[PDB]
Amino acid sequence: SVYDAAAQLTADVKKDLRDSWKVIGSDKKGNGVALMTTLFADNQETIGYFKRLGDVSQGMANDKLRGHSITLMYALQNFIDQLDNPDDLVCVVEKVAVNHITRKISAAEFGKINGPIKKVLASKNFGDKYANAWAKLVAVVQAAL
Amino acid sequence: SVYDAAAQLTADVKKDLRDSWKVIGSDKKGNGVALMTTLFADNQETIGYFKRLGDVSQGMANDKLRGHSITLMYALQNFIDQLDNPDDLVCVVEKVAVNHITRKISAAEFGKINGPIKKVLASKNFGDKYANAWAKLVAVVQAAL
Ligand code: HEM
Numbered sequence A, B: 001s002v003y004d005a006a007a008q009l010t011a012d013v014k015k016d017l018r019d020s021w022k023v024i025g026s027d028k029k030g031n032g033v034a035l036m037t038t039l040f041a042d043n044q045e046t047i048g049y050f051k052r053l054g055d056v057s058q059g060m061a062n063d064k065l066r067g068h069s070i071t072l073m074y075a076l077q078n079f080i081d082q083l084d085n086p087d088d089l090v091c092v093v094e095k096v097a098v099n100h101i102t103r104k105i106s107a108a109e110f111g112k113i114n115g116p117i118k119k120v121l122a123s124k125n126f127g128d129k130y131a132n133a134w135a136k137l138v139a140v141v142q143a144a145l
């Protein structure tokens, strides 16, 4: 299942992920927090999963939130670095999914991160072409949930 | 406290962490697994915490262990990248600590990673000078458990 979703990561899709990531991933703190704040803004309900973070409206100034956002970017950094070896990409995606399964986060719920990503990509001038590429990466994780 | 431990990361200590990581962090999969396998060999008692990984003796062949080992290396990557800003290094360390606290991993238990790190370092021509620099870093996390 996860392997089949990985099959969707074609040569062109991978090229767009590595290219857009060369920019998005150059500022993990900034872009990471931008992602989380956009998620909470567009889907206020997802906040119910982050009670441990406290006052998330403080954004960047919130140490717990900032700490979480930076760590999230390194998960994506991990996935991007494993794009050329489906075997490693899968074992890594399944590792990440473990804790989200325990948190009772469905695939549909996880998919809500697509909007935030699309917006963050556009702030850097990356059109739908890149947005679709990333939706395919998120789909690999969703296949594991 | 974690804040006083982070202050222990002096100029030369940070330089030694960067120089050694430049080599170690080159092969995250290889060194990551060597690290986990050495831990299980020198401290069989810690194996009980990794029941989910299955037969840990399979090493590289065990997909779960490989997924875990790689991800671990990205956590170290994260720490290294935050050495410039103590504030960010702290929120990132406390973040990682959370799940370990939930697993009831004590500071003393966590410190057992120092042995494996020293060995991997030596296998790459990095002696006591660097092993101690990493022990300092590890202590930062120990101060948050
Ligand atoms: C691009 C997608 C995402 C990535 C790469 C990602 C990555 C991570 C990582 C690496 C962690 C830290 C390790 C762990 O505890 O599992 C984490 C924590 C967490 N994630 Fe995800 N995540 C993503 C999306 C989401 C979404 C959409 C939700 C829920 C709406 C979610 C909820 C959580 C929660 C509740 C935590 C714990 C936060 C805390 O209390 O510190 N994640 N995630």
Ligand code: HEM
Residues within 6 Å of the ligand: A098, A099, B046, B049, B050, B052, B053, B068, B071, B072, B075, B076, B096, B099, B100, B103, B105, B109, B110, B111, B112, B113
């Ligand atoms: C360099 C030292 C270490 C670092 C940076 C580190 C980092 C991590 C990371 C990033 C994860 C994945 C995310 C999560 O589930 O929280 C993890 C999982 C875990 N860590 Fe640590 N860890 C280290 C040492 C240890 C030690 C010494 C133990 C045990 C004595 C330990 C026990 C665990 C366990 C049981 C898991 C869950 C594995 C699973 O079920 O997949 N860790 N660690």
